[PDB]
Every structure is written in C-alpha cells, then in structure tokens.
Symmetry: D8
Subunit: 102 residues, 16 copies
Amino acid sequence: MPKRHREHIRKNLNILVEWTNYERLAMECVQQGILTVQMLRNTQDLNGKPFNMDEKDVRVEQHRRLLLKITQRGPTAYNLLINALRNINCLDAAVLLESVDE
Amino acid sequence: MPKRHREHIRKNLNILVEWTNYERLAMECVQQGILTVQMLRNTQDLNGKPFNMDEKDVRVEQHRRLLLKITQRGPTAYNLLINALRNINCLDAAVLLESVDE
Amino acid sequence: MPKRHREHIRKNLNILVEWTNYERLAMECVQQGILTVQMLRNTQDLNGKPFNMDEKDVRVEQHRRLLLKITQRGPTAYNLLINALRNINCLDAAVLLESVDE
Amino acid sequence: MPKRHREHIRKNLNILVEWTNYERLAMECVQQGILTVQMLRNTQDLNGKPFNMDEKDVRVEQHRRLLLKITQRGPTAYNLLINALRNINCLDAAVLLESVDE
Amino acid sequence: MPKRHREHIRKNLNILVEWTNYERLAMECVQQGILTVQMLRNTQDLNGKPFNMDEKDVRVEQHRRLLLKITQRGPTAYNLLINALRNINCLDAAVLLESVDE
Amino acid sequence: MPKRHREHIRKNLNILVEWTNYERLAMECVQQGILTVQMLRNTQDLNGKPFNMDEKDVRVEQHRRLLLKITQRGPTAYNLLINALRNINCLDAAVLLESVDE
Amino acid sequence: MPKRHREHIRKNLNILVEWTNYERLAMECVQQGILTVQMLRNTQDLNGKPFNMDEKDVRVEQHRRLLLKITQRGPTAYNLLINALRNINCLDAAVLLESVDE
Amino acid sequence: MPKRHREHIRKNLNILVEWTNYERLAMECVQQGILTVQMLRNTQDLNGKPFNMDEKDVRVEQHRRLLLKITQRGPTAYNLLINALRNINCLDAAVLLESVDE
Amino acid sequence: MPKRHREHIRKNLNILVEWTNYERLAMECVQQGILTVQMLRNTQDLNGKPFNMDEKDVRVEQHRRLLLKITQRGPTAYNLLINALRNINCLDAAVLLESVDE
Amino acid sequence: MPKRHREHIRKNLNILVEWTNYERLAMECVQQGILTVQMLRNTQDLNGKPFNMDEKDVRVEQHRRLLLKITQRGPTAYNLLINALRNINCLDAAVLLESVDE
Amino acid sequence: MPKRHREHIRKNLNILVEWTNYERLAMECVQQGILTVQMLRNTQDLNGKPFNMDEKDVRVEQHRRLLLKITQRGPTAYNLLINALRNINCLDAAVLLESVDE
Amino acid sequence: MPKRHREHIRKNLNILVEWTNYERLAMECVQQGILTVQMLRNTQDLNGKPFNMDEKDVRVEQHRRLLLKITQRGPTAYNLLINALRNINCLDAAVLLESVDE
Amino acid sequence: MPKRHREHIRKNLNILVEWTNYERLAMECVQQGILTVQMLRNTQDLNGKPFNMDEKDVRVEQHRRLLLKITQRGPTAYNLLINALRNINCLDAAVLLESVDE
Amino acid sequence: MPKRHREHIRKNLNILVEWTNYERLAMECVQQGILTVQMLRNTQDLNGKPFNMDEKDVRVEQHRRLLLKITQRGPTAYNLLINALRNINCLDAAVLLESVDE
Amino acid sequence: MPKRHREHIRKNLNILVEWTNYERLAMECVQQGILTVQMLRNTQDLNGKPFNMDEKDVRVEQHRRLLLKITQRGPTAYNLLINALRNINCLDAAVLLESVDE
Amino acid sequence: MPKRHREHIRKNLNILVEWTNYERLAMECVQQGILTVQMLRNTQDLNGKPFNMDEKDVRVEQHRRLLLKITQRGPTAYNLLINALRNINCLDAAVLLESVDE
C-alpha cells in the first residue's frame, strides 16, 4: 500500500497494539481475509529468544508483530484493518487508523 | 487553527486524554504559554453536576475538557500542544497529534 | 460489478453450478470473505415450495442460487469467485469465469 | 479466425467436449459444411497408440480432437460451430462459445 | 446479396440451367450448405399446373427455379454457387457465374 | 478493345461457340462490317492438321476461331458482336457478351 | 454528327454527287454498314413526280439524295463516308469530305 | 497566307481546276488585282517539255498552275480568289475554297 | 478607313488634284482594283450644272471628285491610293498621302 | 525642333517650294522673326556653281534652300512657318505643313 | 504671362521708361515680332487730352505706355522684351527685367 | 545675407547708384544704424588713384562703393537699405531693391 | 527575525533598558515563553569582570543584555517582546518597539 | 510633513520630552531656523490654567508642547529636529526620531 | 518682444535706472536706432504734474520712463538695449539685462 | 546648487554687493541658518594683504566675499538668500536674485 500508510501504523504501533485485544484481533484478522495458519503462526510466534522476556512483554510484542504483517499486505490492508478493527470493537483505534486520511 | 485539526483531536480525544498525565499536562499547558489561571480553572473544573459522576470518570472528563480548550486556541495550538506533550513525555501521543500531518 | 459480468455468470450459471461441488463451494465462499451465516442461509435455503421438487433438483437450484448472490456482491465478486474456485479445484470453471476477460 | 477465439475453445475444450454428444456432433459438423470424410477420419481416429488408453478416455480425446480441427477452420468457424451446436441441442455450450463475444 | 448479382443469374438463367445437370446440382446444393428438404422440395416441385407442360420442359423449369432460390440466399450465394458448380463439374458455367466479377 | 473484354470472350468462348449457329454467324459477321473474304477464310479454315480431328470437332473449333478474331478487332468489337448476335437470334449469348458490363 | 459536318456535305453536295459513280456508291454504302434495302430504296427512289424530270437529272438528284441520308446517320457518318469513298476510288472527293477537318 | 490554306487548294487543286473555266479565270485573276502580264505568262505557259503532252492535258495543267501561283500570293489570296471565283460564276468552287473556314 | 485619313485627303485635296494627271489616274484607279465603270462615271461626270463652269475648272473638279470617292472606299484606300499614285509617277504626292503616317 | 518635323518639310520640300511665292516668302520670313540679312543672303544665294544651272532652276533651288534653313531653326520653326505662310496666302501649304500634326 | 511678371514691369515702369531710348525701342519692338503699325500707333499716341501736358512729359508717358502693351503680350513677352532691350543696348534695364527671375 | 541678394544689388548697382542722392544717402545710412565714421570714410573715399578720374566719375564710384559695403552687412541689410531708401525718397529704387522678393 | 528589527532594539537599547523595570521584565520574559533558567542566568549574569563596575552600572548592563538575547530569538521575538512589555506596563516602550512598523 | 512622521513623534512624545533638556532645546530650536519669539512663546507658555498643575508637570507639558509645534512645521521638520537634537546631545532620541526611517 | 522680457526690465527697472547715466543713455538710445525726437520727448518729459516732485526724483522717473518705452519696442529691443548699454559702459546692467537668458 | 545659479550671483555680484547693507546682511545670514562664527569670520575677513586697499574698497570686497560663500552652500542657497534678503529689505535685489527663474 502507499508510503504515508506504513509510516502511520509504524509510529502509531503502540496505540493500536494497546487498545485492541490480540486474541480478538489475531483470530479475526486471519479470519478476516488476510493472513493464514502459516502467517499468523510466524507473527504470533517470534524468534524464540523472546523467552528472555517476561510475560507482560511478549504478548505486546506479538500484537506489535501483527500490525507489521498486516501493513505488509495488499493495498486494502488499510481498508481491511479498519474494518476488522471496526468489529474488534476498538473503534478508538479504527479512528486512529482512518483519521489520518480524509 | 485549520479544520482538519479540530477533527483530529476531536475523534482522537481519548488516546490523548489517556496517555498524558493530566497534572503534568495542565500545570504545564497553562505553564506552556496558552491558557491562564482563569482558563484552566474553568477547564479543570466542570459544570458542577459532574458530581453525580464517580471519581474514575471526572479526571478523564477534565483531561478531555483540556484538549478541547487547547484546540480552541490560536493556530499554533498544534505546534504548541505537540511540544508541550513532547515535554510531558507522552511522545506516543505527540506522534498521534503530529503524524496526521507531513 | 460491471454489466458484461452479470450476463456471464447468468447464462453460464449451469456449467458453474455443475463442475464445482457445492459443499466445497458454499462453506468456502462464505469462508472466502463474501457472504455470512445469514446470506448463505437464505441462498442455500429456498422459498420453501421447492419441496415439490425432487432431491436431484434442489441441490442444483441451491448451487444455482449461490452464484446469483455472489454476482450480487461488490466488484471484486469476479476476482473473489475466480480465486475461491481456484481453490475449490474447479479450475475448468475458473477458466470459464475468467476467460471472457483478457 | 482471430486469436481471442483459439484461446477460447482452447482452455474451454473440456466443457465443450463434455456437454455435446460426439456422434451427434461429428456426423453433424462434417454434415454442417466444414470437414470431410478425410478430416473427420483423422480427427475421430487418433495416433494409434491411444490404445493404451481405456475406453472412457478415447471418445473424450476424440471429441477433444474435433473442436481443435474446427478451430482450425476458416473464420466462420465460430459462426459455424455456434450454429452446429445450436442444433446438437447443447445450447449450454453454444452460450459458452458465443458469450465471450458481445 | 448485391444487385448486380441477381441481374446476372437472372438474364443468364438459361446457360446455367442448361450446362449443369440438375440431379447433380439439386442433391448437391441442398447438400452444399444452402437449402433444405423443405426448400428444394418447393423448388424442385412447382405450382402443380406445370402438368400441362410436357416432359422436356418441366425439368428445365425446375432447374431454372433452383438458381432463383439460390440467388435468394445469403450473400455468399455467389461464393456458394460458384463452388458447388465447381464440383458439379460445370466449370464452363462456374466461369459464367464468376467472370462478371474481377 | 479493353482488357476485361478479351478475358470475357476468352473464358466464355464455349457458350458463345455453342448457342450461335456458325453459318448464320460467319456469313453475317463478315457481312456485319468486320472481317473479309480473307479473314473469314483463315478463321473458318484452320492449320490443316485439324484433319486428324473428327467432324463433330472441327466446326466447333472453327466457330471458336471466329470469336478470337472478332475479339481481335477494333474497340467496337464488343458493340459489333453484341449486335451481330442480336440478329443471329442468339439473344441468350448477346446477354452473355453484354451483361458483364453495366 | 456535328453541325460543321452537315454544312459541309450540304453546300458541297454537288462535287460529291459528281465525282463518285452512284452505282458504285449506293451498292457500296448500303454495303458499307450504313443504310438498308429500305433506306437506299427510298433514297434511290424519289417522290414520284421527278418523272417530269429528264433522264440526265434524276440520277443526279438520286445521288444527291444519298449523301443527305448518309449525313443523316450516326456520328461516324463522316468516318464511314470517307472510307466508303476511299474505296469507290473517288479520292478527289474523299479529300473534299476530309480536308475541312485537320 | 496561313498554312491550312495552302493545304486546302493543294489537295483540292482538281475540283478547282475543273469547275472554273480557265480563260474566264486567268484573264480575270490577272484582271482581279493579283498577277501581271509576266506572272500569268509564266503560269499559263509551262516548262516547254509539256509538248509531249496531248491537248486535253495541257490546259488542265495550266489551270492547275494558276491556283498554285494564286496561293503564292499575299494573305488576301483567299479573299481574292473567293471573290474572283464568285464572278467566274463557279460558285460551287467558291464554296469549296471558302467552306473550309467558318 | 480611319478619321485622321479622310481629313488628310480632305484638306490636301488640292495638291493631290494638281500633281497627278487625271487620265493617268482615273483610268488606273478604276484599273487599280477600286471603283468601276459605274463609279468612275459618276465621279468623272458631275451634276450637269458644272456646264456653267469653264474648261479649266471642270477637269480640276472631276479630279477633285475622284479622291473623294477613293477616300470613300475600304480601309486599304490609303494603301490602295499610295500605290496607284506610286505608279502614276506622282511620287511627290504619294509622299504627301503617306508622310502623315509613320 | 522634333524629328518627325524635319522629315516632313524634307520630303515635302517640293510642294512647299512650289505653291508659295519666294519673294513674298523670303522677304517675309526674315521679316517674320527668324533669319537675318546674313542668313537669307547665304540661303537666297548658293554655292556659286549653280550658274551652270538655267534660270528656271535656280529660284526653285533657292526657295528649296529656304525651308531647309527654316527647319534649321528653333522649335517654333513649325509654328513660325505655319503663320508666315498663313500670311504669304499659301494656305494650301500651311495646311500641308500643319495637317501632319493634330 | 505670369502674375509676378506684370507686377515687375508695373512698379519698375520708371527705370525701364528711363534708361531705354524710345525711338530705338518702339521702332525695334514693333520690329521685334510683337506689336504692329496699329498697336504701336495707339501706344505711341495717347488719349488726345495729353496735350495739356508739356513736352517733357508726353514722350515719357508714351514710353511708359509701351511696356504696358508689351506686358500685355504673350508669355514670351518677358523673353521678347529682354532680348529686344539686349539690342537697344540698355543692358542695365535688361538686367532689371531679368534679374527678378533666376 | 542670402546669395540671391548680393547678386541683386550687384548687377543693379547702377540704378541704385543713380536715382538716390549720395549725400542724402551716405549721411543717412551711417545715420541709419549700419556703418560708422570709419566705414563710410573708407567707402566714401577710395584707393587714391581715382584722382586720375574726372569729377563726374568719382561721386558715382563712391556711391557705387556704398551699396557694396551695405550689402556687406548683416542680414537685415536688405530690410535696412529698403527703409533707409524709403526715407531718401528714392522710392523708385526701394521698389527695385524690394520687388525681387515677394 | 528580520534585519530592520535587530537594528531597532540595537540603537534603541537605551530607552528600552531604561523605562522597563528589569525584575518585572526578566522574571516575566523567561516567564513569557522565551528564555529559560539557563538563558536568563547567563544574560542576568555577565562575564565576571563587570565587578570592576559600580552598582549603578551593572543592572543597566544586565537589562541591556536581556533585549540582546530577546532579539536573539525566533521571529515572534518582536510580537513576544511587545506583549511582554505591554504587561510590564512600560507602554511607552512597547510603542517604541512597535511604532517602527505599521 | 508625511503622515507616518506625525504619528511617530505623537506616540513617542514622552521619550523625546524626557531625554532632551528643554532649555537647551527651546533656545536652540528657535535658534535652529524653525519657530520665533512668537511661536516659542505660545509653545513655552500654555493656556494659563496649567497653574493648577504642580511644578514637576508644567515643564514636561511645555517640552511636550514643543515637539507638537515642531511637527507642525515644514517637511524638513524631521531633518530639522534630528539635527537640532544631534546638537542638544540627546543622540539617544535623535536615533529614536530617525530610526523609524531607513 | 516675449513676455519673460517685459517682466524682466519691469521688476528690475530700478537697477537699470540707477547704474546707467540717463543723458548718456537717452541721447544714445534715440541715437541707437530706436525712438525719435518725438518718442524721447514724451518719454524724457512726463505728464506735467511731476512738478510737485523734487529734483532728485524727476530724472529718476524719466530714466525709468525710458526703459518702459524701450521695452515697448520691437523684438530686438533686448538685443538693442543690451548693446546700447554695452556702450553706455554700464556693463554691470548689460549683464543684468542679458543674464536672465542663456 | 545648480550651474545657472552660480553664474547668476557671479556676474551680478556687484548689484547684490551694493544694494544690501552688509552688517544687516552678514549678521543675518549667519543668523539665517547658513554659515557660522567660523565661516563669516573667514568671509568677513580676507587674506590680510587687503590692507593695501583703502577703506572704501574693503567692505565692498567683504560683502562680495559673502555671496560667494552663500553660493557655496547647499541647494537652498537660492531659497535661503532670497528670503534673508527679503528681510534685509533689499527687495530690489531679492528680485534680482529670483527673477532669473520663473
């Protein structure tokens, strides 16, 4: 997708990784029409070293690894994520991801 | 300031009211070169009825009343708030408030 | 989607209703990112009178009711159905549905 | 005949080899004003090795060898085959062979 | 077909009705891809009154009724008749029917 | 005379050599204002070897040698022959010789 | 034929009626490809009253009636008469009839 | 005088040498305002050898030598001779000499 | 002839009537190709009353009546009279009649 | 004076030397405003040899020598001589000398 | 003659009437080619009343009446008088009468 | 002053030296606003040799030497002299000196 | 800020350092939204040698060091200082600092 | 003088009334080439009521009345006052009065 | 003379009436080529009432009446007076009267 | 000041040095706003040698040295001197110094 889009979710990868539940997001995004049993695996999992890292901080990394792969996708990725998140019921981040346009 | 700016802080008045401490913001914003002992009073305080409302929810309203008045201000209001927040050390919202441009 | 597309699946609604398994199609199309537990219900089911009609001829009607709703959809509907059918492994109808273009 | 025509019957040589009876087609096509006692012989027959191949699969090959020779013909070949097939009463393939135009 | 064609076979309906055998023509023309069991019937037969007319003169009328119906046909009718007659082996009339062009 | 004229009587030298009596033609053509006691002699006669050839086939050759010399003539040759033949009462060949024009 | 031609043979109808023998002319002109057993009759004969007129003067009138009818004819009439007279061996009048041109 | 004039009396030197009396012409032409006692002498006389030639044929030569000298003259020679001959009362040659014009 | 010519011989009708002998002129002018036994009569003679007039003065009048009629003539009249007078050997008046030109 | 003037009196030096009395001219011309006791002397006299010449012919020469000197003069010479001669009462030469103009 | 000429001799009629002898002028001017026995009479004489006037003053008036008549004359009058006076040997007035030009 | 002025008084230095008294002129010209006790001295006097010359002829020379010096002067010299002379009461020379203009 | 601004406060650094109290200015300017605990320190303090300098003259130097740093600032520096001074209640210098514009 | 000048000394009438001694100014300004014993009187004096006003405040008013009258003056008034003040040795106000330009 | 000249001697009629002696001027100006025994009288004298006026003041008036009349004169009046005064040896007023030009 | 100004007071330095009292001028000119205790000293005094020169002639030199220095001055020098002299009450020289303009 465009340049001004990757930069968006890039810097704002914290708010989006915070307000949306990840279970409710991952299982839905794959579910949405984007990634697959393979993609979400590699995204949801990590390098393996992350084990050094305490519990609080692995789910957040995961969730942060998600949007990076979603951004990876085809140009709808915006229109895909905005809707998926419209359903996750994280409207306050759907705005975040959409308002930069218009 | 411009139209596309009021709409920004308008819809995204939750993220900004969340990540930035309000004490550290109010006492700094007034401190910044914007509002005054009078402004911040009327903003920090509310109608009076808010008393019906429990503790959790009055500080959040307050903080949400702040950005509305900041938005009220002169066209720097952007460049004012982005910096004030650069100091509040809520960088993850300074981005939010800035990234919509560029 | 375009006019020359509805006419396509319209007249050629027999070949497409024949070569593709319906189970493998319905459960996949809904699955694909098109219709929903509601859509496929109303499509997979019929008016109710169809009961007059013998077994051979209700599944064929069903399957024929599917493509009509798929055609109903947004302009990808082509690009959606061509791929869904690329997976159903009814390539000899994916061609049918695609070859009219190019 | 044109390029976009050979490609048509080429990829869609299965549907056309399926829905139309071959007897009713061969004896009619030659009969139609296309091939001859010589053509249809060489088309209806094959290399000779096809003997390795079981019954189901030789008539289908034959029938598939027909359209290839029909395609071989002069530019009417379309308008010839569409009509011949209009008579074979395989309308659902006459459509197939025609609908790509218009 | 064109005007200058009907006039041709019109005035020159004697030479063409003379040099070509009619059996070898009728059974071939129908055979050719022009008329049908119905056409050739009505052409080969006549009003019924022709009975007044002696044998010599009914076959000639018949044969003369043929070219009139052939002329009746679609614009190939020229290119159809020239070839059919190329086979009847009445080359000396195929010339007649062709030479007016070029 | 023109090119498209020699080609005419050339290929159609059979019909014209058939329908018109030769006596009634030769004695009239010379008579017409074309050839002379010398021309018609050399045309009506032949090389001398023609003797190998049976009766049926010498008069036909003769008659066929006539039109070749008539064609030889000045540009009226058309308008000359068409009229001469209008008198020979071989109208069905006068047409032949004329209809190629107009 | 043209105007300046009728005027020619008109005024110079004496020289032409004098130098050319009439027998050798009449029997040749008709013979030439101009008039007919009917024309030459009416020309060679006269009204009937000419009987008042002596022998010398009826043949001269006749001969003078000839050129008038020859002039009557089609535009070759010049080119016809000049040649006919080239044969009559009245060259000294063929010149007369030709020299006015060129 | 012009070219097309010398050619006239040149070829038509017989008719003019025939119809006009020579006495009535010579004695008048000189008389007319053209030649002189010297000219007409040399014209009326000849080389001297003409003696070989019989009577009929010397006066005709003479008379034929006249028009040649008249033609020799100045451009009126036409308008001179036409009038002189208008008087000689050989009108039927005055026409001859004039009609080529107009 | 032109205007400036009549005026010439008009005023200068004395010199011309003086230097040229009249016998040698009259008998020559008529002789020249101008007037006739009739003209010269009426010119050479006079009204009849001239009888009142003595001898000296009638020949002079006559001679003066001549040039008036010569002037009367066709446009050569100049070129006619100049030459006639060139012969009369009245050169000193031929000059007179010519010199006004050039 | 002009060229066409010297030529005039030049060729017409006879008429002018004839009709005008010389006494009445010389004594008047000098008298007129042209020549002088010196000019007229040399003109009226001659070379001296003229003595060979008889009386008739010396006065005529003299008189002829006059006009030559008058012509010699300034451009009026025309307008001078025409008037002088208008007085000499040789009007019939004043015309001569004038009429060439106009 | 021109205007600027009459004005000249008009105002300067004293100098010119003074320096030139009148006898030597009158008898010369008439003599010159201007006036006549009649003109000079009427100029040289006067009204008749001049008798009142003494001798000195009548010759001066006379002489003054001369130039007035000379001025009266044709346009040479200048070129006439300048020369006449060039001879009278009144050069000092010839200058007067000429110098106004150039 | 101009050229055409010096030439004037130059040639006409006699009339002007005659009609105007010199005393009345010299004593006035100097008096006028032109020359001076020095100028008029050298003008009124002469070389000294003039003594050879008799009385009549020295005053005239003097007076003639005056106008030469007056002419010598500035461009008014005309307008100066014309007026000075208008006073000297030699009007008949004031005219002389003025009339050449206008 | 602009050039014509630095020159302003530069030359007029005395009036501005005089009329505005420094305490009321420093503590307000820093307070205003310009300098900081660091800036005002280095400005309010000096090199250290200033100790040679008596009391009167160090506060004045200080105050004079202030405006130099204020001038140092961003282009508002004008609009900043004019307002800060509008509050210091040194209006008579706010004018000074503003009036140079407009 | 210009508008932007009156406004200058108008608002900045305090600084200028402060830094320049008035004695040293008044006695110099009048002295300068501006006002007069009359002007400075009316300026230096006041309405008369000023008596209500204490000593401090009358000299200041006076001095303030001065510049108002100086401003009143002709357009040099600037260039006059700037120099006068250059001498008063109030350079720090000469700047004030000048710096607004340039 | 011009306007800017009358104004000159008008206002500067004192200096000119002062520096130039009047005797030496009057007797010279009249003498110069300007006024006359009549002019200078009326100028040098006055109305008659001037008698009221003492001696000092009548000569000055006189002298002042002079230049007024000199100014009255023709356009040289400048060039006349400047020179006259160049001689009066009042150079310091000749300058006055001249310097206004150039 | 301009060129045409220095030349003015230059040549007319006598009239101006005469009519204006010097005391009343010097003490006023310096007084005027031009020179100074230094200028007027050096102008009012001289080289020192002037002592050779008698009293009458030193004050005049002085006064003449003044205008030279006044001329020296800035371009008003005209407008300065004209007014200063308007006060000196030497109006008759103020005119002198002004009238050269306008």
